[PDB]
Design a protein around this ligand. Structure first.
Ligand code: DDS
Ligand code: MG
Ligand code: MG
Length: 539
DNA sequence: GACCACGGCGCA
DNA sequence: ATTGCGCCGTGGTC
């Protein structure tokens, strides 16, 4: 059923390629082929072959396109069945699975990936027949978004390697200073990075009362949370909390990053995974630049490492109280939509309450803490964990939650209806109609069911802010090109741009606008914007 | 080496 | 009884 023709593929053919590794920016293009009609074309020289394609359409289009950009080609990504499958069911996140479920086998031969892409696209496109809302998301958001992501990936972001190189030697000494103490207090050395070894030390050798257990193996958890509950029980606990901090940071960022610099660009090249989340958010892989530190002083010193190119400036844009604004529009709650019409800030209001200080006294590090409290509580946190969390009585934590939802009467109502129809329909969806199947909404085990429910009503809110960000990226990108500006990073509701100093102002102004007016809601969408030579100074 | 489950923990 | 992610060592394979 499949014939073979000489390389030169007819326009609009489905590409198939094989990389030496999963990272497009570092991969060697080992094989390139294409499938169209009922024939398949294998390119004798892939790199040379790339020059002929006009569009990379097929399985993992964005990745091949990223490699193209890296090589000097402007080959934009087109149709990609993965995107179609991701829209039908966000649990379709890998080609292997998409293939086994929709019509084939993900192999290692380019010709086969080409044939596979064609038929997968044929089958998946049919399944979308009549899914107007999903087709809208595909052609108006995803497909075009993939191209934006390609440019972002190949563009990359600059890092101060010398800065981290030296920061490492410094932290190396503090870590040593902390472990050396931990051992003194324990009366003997042991692998502090070993959770099992530390467990025995705290709970058996010393007599510290265990607080909780681990999920799959029932060990006495040694969590930061457990450790904070014991901070005053013994001097060793605080030291271990600082060791945990430094080592987490040093081995996850300070050391790995400097070695991820690409030779040809001198920049860090993250990957932006478009079909990896159940709610519609993107994920940042290999270099994951979506979880760069920002909470602690050492975290900030690390964020300061992300810098603009000489003669440029980074522009950081971030939606204010994003998911709360989305919630007001989804729930349609009176008091909540008014909160925003009145210019209030829930995070600041909660922070004022938490630290018993006047609103105008809340610093950013207090407001942050407030955020995990508001979203934690909104999405289901228990009084128990709340009380433990804020270190307050169980009652006052129970009161905080009582008023919180009582203040926004429509929220709980919306949640219920979201859950009701999630039960009957078997899935919940976003404003734009992004679907997430939550079968466990009818599990007979309370534990499982309620866990399903929390996953279910969070999806429309989280997923709607995602559609929103993606849409804004699709609208903003072209404007930046014509303006000679770059879109470097996306952090769920934030965007990091790099604009020429002469234009930094004008770019910030334009982006903030595109973002706030992306899709008008029952509430305005505010965007805090910052400009500076490093990511930290921007935000 | 390469990979995996876990417990942990960085961010949104 | 927060949700959604990806990456790091440790232990234990293969
Ligand atoms: N801990 C959490 N749990 C659940 N959802 C959370 C969350 N933290 C954030 N989100 C979701 C909801 C918000 C969204 C983006 O995170 P930002 O930190 O930006 O919080 P934003 O509310 O937008 O306020 P801004 O500080 O920027 O003014 O991710
Ligand atoms: Mg925000
Ligand atoms: Mg943010």
């Amino acid at each position: 059923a499949l014939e073979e023709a000489p390389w030169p593929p007819p326009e609009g053919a489905f590409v198939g390629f094989v990389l030496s590794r999963k990272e497009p920016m570092w991969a060697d293009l080992l094989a390139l082929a294409a499938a169209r009609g009922g024939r398949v074309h294998r390119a004798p020289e892939p790199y040379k072959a790339l020059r002929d394609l006009k569009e990379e359409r097929g399985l993992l289009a964005k990745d091949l396109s990223v490699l193209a950009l890296r090589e000097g080609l402007g080959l934009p990504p087109g149709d990609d069945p993965m995107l179609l499958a991701y829209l039908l069911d966000p649990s379709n996140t890998t080609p292997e699975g998409v293939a086994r479920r929709y019509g084939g086998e993900w192999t290692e031969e380019a010709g086969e990936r080409a044939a596979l892409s064609e038929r997968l696209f044929a089958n998946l496109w049919g399944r979308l027949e009549g899914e107007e809302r999903l087709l809208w998301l595909y052609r108006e958001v995803e497909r075009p978004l993939s191209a934006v992501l390609a440019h972002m990936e190949a563009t990359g972001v600059r890092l101060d390697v010398a800065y981290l190189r030296a920061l490492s030697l410094e932290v190396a000494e503090e870590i040593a200073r902390l472990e050396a103490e931990v051992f003194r207090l324990a009366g003997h050395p042991f692998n502090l990075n070993s959770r099992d070894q530390l467990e025995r030390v705290l709970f058996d050798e010393l007599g510290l009362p265990a607080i909780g257990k681990t999920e799959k193996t029932g060990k006495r958890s040694t969590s930061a949370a457990v450790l904070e509950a014991l901070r005053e029980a013994h001097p060793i606990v605080e030291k271990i909390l600082q060791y945990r901090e430094l080592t987490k940071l040093k081995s996850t960022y300070i050391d790995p990053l400097p070695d991820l610099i690409h030779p040809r660009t001198g920049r860090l090249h993250t990957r932006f995974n478009q079909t990896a989340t159940a709610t519609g958010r993107l994920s940042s892989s290999d270099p994951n630049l979506q979880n760069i530190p920002v909470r602690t002083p050492l975290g900030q010193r690390i964020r300061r490492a992300f810098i603009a190119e000489e003669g440029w400036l980074l522009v950081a844009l971030d939606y204010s109280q994003i998911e709360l604004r989305v919630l007001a529009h989804l729930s349609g709650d009176e008091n909540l939509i008014r909160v925003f019409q009145e210019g209030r800030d829930i995070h600041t209001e909660t922070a004022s309450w938490m630290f018993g200080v006047p609103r105008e006294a809340v610093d950013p590090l207090m407001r942050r803490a407030a955020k995990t409290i508001n979203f934690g509580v909104l999405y289901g946190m228990s009084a128990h964990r709340l009380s433990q969390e804020l270190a307050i009585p169980y009652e006052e934590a129970q009161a905080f939650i009582e008023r919180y939802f009582q203040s926004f009467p429509k929220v709980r109502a919306w949640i219920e209806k979201t859950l009701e129809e999630g039960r009957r329909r078997g899935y919940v969806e976003t404003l734009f109609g992004r679907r997430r199947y939550v079968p466990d909404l009818e599990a007979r085990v309370k534990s499982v069911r309620e866990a399903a429910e929390r996953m279910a009503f969070n999806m429309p809110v989280q997923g709607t802010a995602a559609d929103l960000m993606k849409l804004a990226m699709v609208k903003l990108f072209p404007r930046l090109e014509e303006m000679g500006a770059r879109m470097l990073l996306q952090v769920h509701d934030e965007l990091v741009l790099e604009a020429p100093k002469e234009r930094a102002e004008a770019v910030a102004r334009l982006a903030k606008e595109v973002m706030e007016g992306v899709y008008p809601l029952a509430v305005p969408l505010e965007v805090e914007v910052g400009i500076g030579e490093d990511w930290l100074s921007a935000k």
